[PDB]
Design a protein around this ligand. Sequence first.
Ligand SMILES: [Mn+2]
Ligand SMILES: [Mn+2]
Ligand SMILES: [Mn+2]
Ligand SMILES: [Mn+2]
Ligand SMILES: [Mn+2]
Ligand SMILES: [Mn+2]
Ligand SMILES: [Mn+2]
Ligand SMILES: [Mn+2]
Ligand SMILES: [Mn+2]
Ligand SMILES: [Mn+2]
Ligand SMILES: [Mn+2]
Ligand SMILES: [Mn+2]
Ligand SMILES: [Mn+2]
Ligand SMILES: [Mn+2]
Ligand SMILES: [Mn+2]
Ligand SMILES: [Mn+2]
Lengths: 206, 207, 206, 207, 206, 207, 206, 207
Amino acid sequence: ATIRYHEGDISAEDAARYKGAIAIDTETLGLVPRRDRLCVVQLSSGDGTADVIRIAAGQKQAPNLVHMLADPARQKIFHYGRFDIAVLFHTFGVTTTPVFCTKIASRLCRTYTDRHGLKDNLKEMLEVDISKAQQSSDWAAETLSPAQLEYAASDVLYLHALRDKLTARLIRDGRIEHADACFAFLPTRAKLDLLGWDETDIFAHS
Amino acid sequence: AATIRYHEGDISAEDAARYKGAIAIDTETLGLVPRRDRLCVVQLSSGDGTADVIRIAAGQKQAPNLVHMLADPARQKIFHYGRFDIAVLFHTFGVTTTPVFCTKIASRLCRTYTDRHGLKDNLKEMLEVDISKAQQSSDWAAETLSPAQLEYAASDVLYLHALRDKLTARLIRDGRIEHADACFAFLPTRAKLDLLGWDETDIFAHS
Amino acid sequence: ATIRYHEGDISAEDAARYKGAIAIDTETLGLVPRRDRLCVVQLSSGDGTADVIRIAAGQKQAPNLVHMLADPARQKIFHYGRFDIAVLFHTFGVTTTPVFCTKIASRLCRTYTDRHGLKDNLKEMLEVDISKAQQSSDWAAETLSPAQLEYAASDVLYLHALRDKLTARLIRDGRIEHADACFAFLPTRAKLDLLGWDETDIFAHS
Amino acid sequence: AATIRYHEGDISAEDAARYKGAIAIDTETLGLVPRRDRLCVVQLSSGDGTADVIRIAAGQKQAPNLVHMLADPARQKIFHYGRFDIAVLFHTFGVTTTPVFCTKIASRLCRTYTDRHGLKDNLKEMLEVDISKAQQSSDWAAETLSPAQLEYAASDVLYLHALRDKLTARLIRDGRIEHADACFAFLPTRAKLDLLGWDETDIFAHS
Amino acid sequence: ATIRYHEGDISAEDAARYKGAIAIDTETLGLVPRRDRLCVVQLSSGDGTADVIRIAAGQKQAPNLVHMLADPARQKIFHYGRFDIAVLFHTFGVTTTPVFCTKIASRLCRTYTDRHGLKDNLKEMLEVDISKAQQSSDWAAETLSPAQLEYAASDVLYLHALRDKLTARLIRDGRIEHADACFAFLPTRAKLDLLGWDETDIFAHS
Amino acid sequence: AATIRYHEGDISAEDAARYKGAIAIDTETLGLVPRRDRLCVVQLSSGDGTADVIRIAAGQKQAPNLVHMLADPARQKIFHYGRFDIAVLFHTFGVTTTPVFCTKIASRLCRTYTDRHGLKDNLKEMLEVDISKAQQSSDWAAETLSPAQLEYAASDVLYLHALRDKLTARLIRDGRIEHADACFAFLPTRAKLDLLGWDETDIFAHS
Amino acid sequence: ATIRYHEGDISAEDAARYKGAIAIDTETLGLVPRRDRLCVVQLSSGDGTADVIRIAAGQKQAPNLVHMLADPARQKIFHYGRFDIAVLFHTFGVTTTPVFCTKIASRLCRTYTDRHGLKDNLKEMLEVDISKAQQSSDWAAETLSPAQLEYAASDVLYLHALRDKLTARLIRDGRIEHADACFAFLPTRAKLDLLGWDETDIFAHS
Amino acid sequence: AATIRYHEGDISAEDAARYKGAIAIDTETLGLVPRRDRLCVVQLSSGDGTADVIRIAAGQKQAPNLVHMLADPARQKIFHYGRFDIAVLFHTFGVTTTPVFCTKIASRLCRTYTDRHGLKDNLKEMLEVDISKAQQSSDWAAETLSPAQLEYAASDVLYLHALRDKLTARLIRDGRIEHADACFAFLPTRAKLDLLGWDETDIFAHS
Ligand SMILES: [Mn+2]
Ligand SMILES: [Mn+2]
Ligand SMILES: [Mn+2]
Ligand SMILES: [Mn+2]
Ligand SMILES: [Mn+2]
Ligand SMILES: [Mn+2]
Ligand SMILES: [Mn+2]
Ligand SMILES: [Mn+2]
Ligand SMILES: [Mn+2]
Ligand SMILES: [Mn+2]
Ligand SMILES: [Mn+2]
Ligand SMILES: [Mn+2]
Ligand SMILES: [Mn+2]
Ligand SMILES: [Mn+2]
Ligand SMILES: [Mn+2]
Ligand SMILES: [Mn+2]
């Protein structure tokens, strides 16, 4: 199938499709990790297909997903990893590593625009169109709608391609090393957020 | 206080060799925009109560012995708020200072009960030391640095070893030494992003 | 009829339809109770029908309405009760109790959105559409238009259903007790507003 | 001043029994974010001019005698701004402190002629008492609390009975004691909503 | 004709149509009277017809217009008189008196809205539609377009009717005396503006 | 200073008759929201160095002799910032005070070289008089007004005649006495619009 | 052709078309000259045709373009020259002089509007329509799209005409001398920007 | 200090002739809006330690000898923040003062290490001179200027030659004298744009 569903954790069979980079996004009940639980983890290996894993209330374990997230041999790709890395660390205790963030890379090379959302990035870098629902969706439902399923999958289907396009810009425009040091600090940035520094830049004076 | 060793242009090879471990360091400039306000002074201590104060001439783009200590991965460099000085040294010399310990990032990560993370209050509370802020900001590119100027420059580095050590023990006690080290590792990139114009935005925010 | 009209007070016959929760909203000349008089009280028992009571200038009495509002055996349901409780206390002297507020409950469980208006709530929680006039309507007119009448009734027709939907979220997501303590403090919050603390949170430092 | 009874971990069963009515109480932490800054001290007075100062060790999640007084519905708990400390005690111990009287909510509800609702100015005007704010914020997780620290902690609670009583008579005189009681009843929920992340928004506003 | 044109001043014949209230608005080169000159004065007697008077550069005199503006026997009606009274005083030296301001009256009785522009007022109070150009029009042109002419006339054609509608609200809602004291202070408010207090309320502390 | 005549509820008929011209006047309340903070004191001077200080009891809604002076169109009333006190007297007594002279509107209209338009600085510059702001805001609804309270209340009105006269001569000199009179005429409406809720907006702005 | 392409520098043949004013705009990788390189210089002599010069990475020389920009006998026309003068000085070391800025002139005479963009100016002053892309375009591409080419040319095709229209306003409304002193200070304003005063007005107190 | 030459209306022809080079100059008004607050005093020094203080009467629109020095292209005029005074002199007399040197634009262009660009701090650091700001802003349109007023007016110009010269040497040293001269050339237009209403916007911004 185009989208592969899992309850609680990705199957070993489908975890084995990921031999390189893993594209990933989550869905939650909101933007405060300590208040709003993790509901969905969506993955893609780059081949046009997704794994959508439904996370249950109170579930603190996903052994196969956690293994992938922890695996230093496979890069995990987010658009704004700062948040999802924090969600995964709060829920599972796992420090996702290493990571590539297409929003940080966008801010570092697409210096001519202020539009750094994923939709704007995919339209310019790949000519792909994606749509935003309406902001208001209960991702903790019993049964996710099929709309809910394709929204989640479209968040990870293109991150491989987008990473490649942006990587060539960073190298062309000379800031690939800046992006990589940003990627290495990112899990720390996410843990400071969980600790309450989420609205301050630690590198400022205040 | 005191005992200041004064140098013109660069630290002599002899005094550089006094530095067998961490290097305390601050600079003085003509202001806060590196591409506009030139580096005037770099000041250095090895943590024994002495300081090397190197005066930097306008247009000078070379400092062999200082640049070697800055680029030397074996000796840590200690600033209070290194984000600024690392950018100034890269813009002036092409040198990327590394590895660093920043006592202001440390202060923020463990001195969570306070908003005063300047050097003066850090020293007073962590070491029971007084330093004096200059009554008015001064011309650091003056033809002759005053005695008061050399003493103010020196005081910027005389206690950084001892402050690093007390803040490290706090970061260990309160469980954030790893968060701090990750900060120090990113800090040179942070300073390079300043010079390129991202200086008033946090690259990790949405905007 | 679908909408039942009253002058000054609800009839005893129509007040008797309310054997459980009373859904309620008001219409006024504006948002300052001491300046802008109460004009309309709209009620619904949950059955698709409304009572719309036209309040006259200077009227400080509505014995049957006031009895319903004061009755601790019947919950009164508002979307943002904070304001209407203050209007009713200023006009009639009545402390409406006990109350359920679908906006407080929305802010407490719909943690994934910032859209907490009634229209947004009804569309997501019940799939119902309602429309906003244009903000500018003289609710003190001689004769209310029939448009004016259905706008007022649509503000109370769904509050029962909406309360039920949101209540199951609060329990699912674990904040029903938080919502109930909010409901108990609400009439105090409204009286502090009438006293001039309306733009400060009393629980802050300032 | 004085007479401070010092305890490690929990108040002894004997001193808990001195408390047959209302309990004055404040805490000290490593800062203002409870999930980050641990509880270090809880301080208690029964209103007789003595205080119990209980030092809380890192990671400690249990305090039998203190948690019994906090959860005990028969003895009121008095804080100046209890919204914060109630959240800290719930996060540290799982205990919901109740019932409470908050002298800062009281100050705001009846001291309508002023903007200064801190403890220091409340005490000066209501009781003609001076307390001293620390010259600089301190490390409350220190290995040994100083004498000055124990005296500052104690002063936080020594006058709360007398201040509660004077503010109560003002709330009665000016007709808002009921508004105040309703506040106190909501205050534990208010503190729990803080811990869940609503801490910078008023749940009763539109946004 | 529907619109009557004049160069420099209104003719005596057309000034004689005004036996009661005079509705009036101006057009200028912008919103700083000392920088942006007066270009057009538009008038209406209430009968569906307008006089549009083109003011020339540097012209400091319009004897018949000034007589009307100065005449305490005839009320002058503006929507936001504060500005135009200042323009007329700067250009001609004339203190327009007495005045009725449909924007002040709108803010005083239409307490249920924040839309106090003339367009919003005419649509609700009279059901009339008017349109806004695009904000950018050179009112000092050689020859005003016919569009320019009807825009200017539509600013004064309805002020009589609008004044009547709003006056009945003020009396109904009990603030006619508040409105009249506002009208008496208005020319002073405009002269303080010309003196440099234009962005402070003189009745505040600062 | 001094000589204060104290009254309970209303000024006696005898002392009212001392007032054959302008009336200086200020009030004291429990705060700045009239519908919440009750009038506690009204203070009056005829400009001879004496003052009448009338204490107002909670709930009192009548003051025959004072309300006659307030409503009396033959004697001008002088406040420093009358916008507030006119609203308080209308809310408490139903009386519209008129006609008024406001020394703060006057100060703003002619003392154009400064931003300090409080009474204290007006008096110091216009009359070379010192008054003292209370060290802390006080409970003006106290059972017994202190001596210090009566002296602070009195000083609010002892110099208003002399300040009115010096500011009038400045308004005449600099050509804005007419602007000032128009202000004074609108000021009661301005205060009534405050009570109705327009208190944080200027009715003459667009919004 | 309507648009004439050049690599690196304008040809001598096409530089010779410019016997009077030179209309000019640039395209870059963004708005920080020290970070975002110069990519395109677009020119027009006023005749409906443009020269579009593609600037290569790291190129610090364009001898013929620089000669034109430096030439005090030919006025260079920008819409907001402040930025492009800084880009040209950073890239080439050239102080463009003398200059006429249609945005400064717009702010000085079109005192009745706040719309001082080029699109708004061309629509009112000349009745010409131009369109904005979408803000997000990589001007450093290998091969500029033909869309990219006409966007760049439309930025300079009308500046001659627009300069003439605005110049007659400045003279009519009496501020031509104010505009000319602004034009003389403009290259200094741009160099202060490159030095870090770009977000302060040097003539203020702070 | 001192030696002040007082003039009514205009400087006498004799004292004007003392001025054979640059002219230091400041004014005093009734406030910051020229169309509202009239010019009261113009003060002048030739840099020898003396000053001419010319009192300007209300409505006066002519000053032959002063207007000649202001309009005279051979003698530079020195203000600290000339943007304001140039606008006041143009509004009062129709004269465009030129050419000018502005020590505040100079201070901002070379004193890049500080935010304090007032005259007082400029003088203290560049010349080691103290001047005193008036304890309170004064009525400069008084019938008789006090001795203190004439001394404060004079001090505004007594050191402007010496401060111009020290700031010029800094602008030369740090490479911005040309930037400064371009500023001075635009400054009269800048002041004329103030009078026309652009006074709170930078004409070189987008908005
Ligand atoms: Mn995400
Ligand atoms: Mn998504
Ligand atoms: Mn430093
Ligand atoms: Mn220093
Ligand atoms: Mn409602
Ligand atoms: Mn409604
Ligand atoms: Mn506390
Ligand atoms: Mn404490
Ligand atoms: Mn108008
Ligand atoms: Mn119009
Ligand atoms: Mn007062
Ligand atoms: Mn007082
Ligand atoms: Mn451009
Ligand atoms: Mn373009
Ligand atoms: Mn000056
Ligand atoms: Mn002065």
